[PDB]
Amino acid sequence: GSHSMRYFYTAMSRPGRGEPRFIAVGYVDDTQFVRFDSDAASPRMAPRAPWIEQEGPEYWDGETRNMKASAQTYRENLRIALRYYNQSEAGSHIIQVMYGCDVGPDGRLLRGHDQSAYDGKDYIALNEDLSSWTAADTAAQITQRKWEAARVAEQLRAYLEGLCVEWLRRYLENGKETLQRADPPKTHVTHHPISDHEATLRCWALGFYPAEITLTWQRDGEDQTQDTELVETRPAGDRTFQKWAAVVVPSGEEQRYTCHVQHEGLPKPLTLRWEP
């Protein structure tokens, strides 16, 4: 199917407790494959997936140098952002960055991303055209004017169309046993009376990959979106994910409810019910 590569940077200042922490993680789809932590005893870009380990010394050395440089750059950007928002040097602040590329089945660029936040709020984003910027406020507009002057968008576009897609393709090939394998959800419905005239039906999906899944309850064929309790999709720790959806139903009407499951690993959507 379609695939994505995404890097996530977090830079967190901590006045009185040294220089800002910088953590970078890299993902292909829902699979983390590299990490860098400036607080590690010996900071370096390190493997987090088996298929990335075959990359040679030049890869890891280059990526390590780059992550150290990026750490410095975003420490500086934290100071700059302090100035842009008229904030004191006493407080702790965070810059987050997510960037990367989406490609289709034929490996062609579907779209590129480079977006950042300051203290959890949108700061600046490369538009889909990979040529203009969306700044969330006047500070970010200052940054935008800087990046327009230096034609940063052109360089990012060069990265996203070239190296990003090429290396994503390389990774997809090297890890095709896992990255190009969908694991369908193992599904079942549980039933727990809460009272003499109400019962919870809980629709479970387990052991699926990738994380993207749709779990819905229908009553007499009508979607129960407003009445369905949906937990956040959560990692199992073995690359796979888990999710459930719960509905409270009148006792004796359980068979009027059906759970519908959509996932890439499934040839067709599933319908299941409580089976007493």
Partner: peptide, 9 residues
């Protein structure tokens, strides 16, 4: 592979 583009805020 990570990006290498100068982006000072």
């Amino acid at each position: 592979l990570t990006v290498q583009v100068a982006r000072v805020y």
